């Protein structure tokens, strides 16, 4: 009795809502991102005795930063040369090197240069993947995507790379983290904590698996949707890194062709004898990791065997491991890696896998726009840490399930990293009762 209304300010309660998120930058940069925004130092506090539901499928900031990655790529690629006048008819014979069938463009053509008087004859070096065959005589050839879109050369000195990015909350909005180790991608966390901004998430572009990423806390974690057994993509997050060594062994000769102030870059000549580019895997780490992954996956599926095959059909972005290293894009044969089976009941030896490289790459989510990678001189070596897998499943039948790699959609790769965070809106104006009146 004798209760009256009172109001309170600074109330600790929140709702869940969409918002626009702020981003951070780095001191050193390539030089919209190169000097902006700010580069703060974050801190973290633990929300004791707080339980909150999380869901890595429904959360919105993944799509937000997907749009941000697209917009940054477009703004970076906007002040660049358009390669339209290269769409003329190519006459290729391709017999200059010791072996020709590997690369198969070595292609003469006419180009206007610096006078607009009359086109002059030039020749360059190209890969047969980027070359398509015109009708009639086989020696006639065309560029691959010019029947569909315009092709832009990337300027080499503004090259974009996985710079770590921190996502800052705006004022009045809080970010929740769920520091629990065995979080399953959905459900209630009882280990809630808050930050001002996230850690250094890198824009990693890869297919069939992901790399240069974070690592799990306990053992290997499996994240998947649970609306139905019919799933698009299942994420596997490793607790232990495996090392990959990639190499393009040959040196290349960059040559420049002048088109106004632009200067088109092409390949002149490969130095020395031709060797095919390849990657290397520690065999014991790979097969032990596969055994651990399969014997952990059979928790979900009770009595059926587990068997792996490589993917079938589609473009090269899903049949092969594709990624970027340096300035060069690699497509790696993964047939030998995924040939295992298991019944349902430290660095010895090395698997080598063959690769192919191509210069004209479509946008990694979309067709109707393509970009031309510039040639990179010299031999290229790379070392990376693979942190997880993106898998899909077949139907199969009784006694046997089947899992094969996939993951052509680039958004699920960033969904594999931003599973922790969630954005909430603060509602600090909770009312209350009290045993007190107001002065009259």
């Amino acid at each position, epitope marked *: 009795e004798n209760l009256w209304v009172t109001v309170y300010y600074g109330v600790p309660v929140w709702k869940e809502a969409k918002t626009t998120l702020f981003c951070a930058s780095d001191a050193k940069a390539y030089e919209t991102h190169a000097c902006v925004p700010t580069d703060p130092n974050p801190q973290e506090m633990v929300l004791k005795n707080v339980t909150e539901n999380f869901n890595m*499928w429904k959360n919105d900031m993944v799509d937000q930063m997907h749009e941000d990655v697209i917009s940054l790529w477009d703004q970076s690629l906007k002040p660049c040369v358009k390669l339209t006048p290269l769409c003329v008819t190519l006459n290729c014979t391709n017999a200059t090197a010791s072996n020709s069938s590997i690369i198969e463009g070595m292609c003469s053509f006419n180009i206007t240069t610096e006078l607009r008087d009359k086109r002059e004859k030039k020749n360059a070096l190209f890969y047969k993947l980027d070359i398509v065959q015109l009708d009639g005589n086989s020696s006639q050839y065309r560029l691959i995507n010019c029947n*569909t879109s315009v092709i832009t050369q990337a300027c080499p000195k503004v090259s974009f790379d996985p710079i770590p990015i921190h996502y800052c909350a705006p004022a009045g909005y809080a970010i929740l983290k769920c520091n629990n180790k065995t979080f399953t991608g959905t459900g209630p966390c009882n280990n809630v904590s808050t930050v001002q901004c996230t850690h250094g998430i890198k824009p990693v572009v890869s297919t069939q698996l992901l790399l240069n990423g974070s690592l799990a806390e306990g053992e290997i974690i499996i994240r998947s*949707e649970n609306i139905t057994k019919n799933v*698009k993509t299942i994420i596997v997050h490793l607790n232990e890194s495996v090392k990959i060594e990639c190499t393009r062994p040959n040196n290349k000769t960059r040559t420049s062709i002048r088109i106004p102030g632009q200067w088109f870059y092409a390949t002149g000549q490969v130095i020395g004898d031709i060797r095919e580019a390849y990657c290397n895997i520690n065999e014991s780490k790979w097969n032990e990791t596969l055994q651990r992954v399969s014997k952990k996956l059979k928790e979900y599926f009770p009595h059926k065997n587990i068997t792996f095959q490589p993917s079938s059909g589609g473009d090269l*972005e*899903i049949t092969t491991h594709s990624f970027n290293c340096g300035g060069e894009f690699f497509y790696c044969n993964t047939s030998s890696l995924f040939n295992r089976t298991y019944m349902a009941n430290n660095s010895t030896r090395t698997i080598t896998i063959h690769c192919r490289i191509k210069q004209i790459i479509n946008m990694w989510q979309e067709v109707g726009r393509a970009m031309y990678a510039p040639p990179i001189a010299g031999n290229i070596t790379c070392i990376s840490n693979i942190t997880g897998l993106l898998l899909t499943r077949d*139907y199969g039948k009784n006694n046997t399930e089947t899992f094969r790699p996939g993951g*052509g959609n680039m*958004k699920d790769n960033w969904r594999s990293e931003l599973y922790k965070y969630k954005v909430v809106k603060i509602e600090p104006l909770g009312v209350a009762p009290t045993r007190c009146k107001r002065r009259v």
Partner: antibody
Amino acid sequence: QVRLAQYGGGVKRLGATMTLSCVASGYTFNDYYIHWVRQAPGQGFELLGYIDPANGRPDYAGALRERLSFYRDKSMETLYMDLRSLRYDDTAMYYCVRNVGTAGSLLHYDHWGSGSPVIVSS
Amino acid sequence: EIVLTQSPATLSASPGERVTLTCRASRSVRNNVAWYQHKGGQSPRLLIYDASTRAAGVPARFSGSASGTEFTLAISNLESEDFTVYFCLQYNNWWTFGQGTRVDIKR
């Protein structure tokens, strides 16, 4: 608004390889999966397989992995079946269907195409 | 794997009345069940998805319900145009189809 036109069909000779085509018109072509369903006369429907038009990823039924093939062209947004080695039991009404799906899972079908009947005999 | 047994094969009613079709699942499919109306030759139309939700543009006289491992399609105001085939679909797993059921004129 959305339409799924189908072309090819009629009578095909025994033992040959046949091709069906579909054209989608009024929606974002990369967003929705496409399934291929058929109905034999006197029998219920059954699924042959499905295709992702974004990356060209197929998936096939267990009994017909060797005879089927799906692919697509993204610029003319056109989808193609190839079926090899036609047999007499393949007499059926064939449809493409668009599939509604979430970010992680697939769900019910919304639209059915005009279809393409196939009569196999020599 | 999953076998949708639609029941019965044929239902008979006078126009305007109520009619009820059953679909029996072989095992648990949660509520990943849809119901479709099949026209006399044309493209079938989605009636109901998730076992109780009427789809967009569908007339309101249609209704559907779940009872665990059994699903129910009910038409309250059965029209002359509605004397056609209806069939039940599931998508909890790999995709299967029932036999369908023809609604004809009672006499």
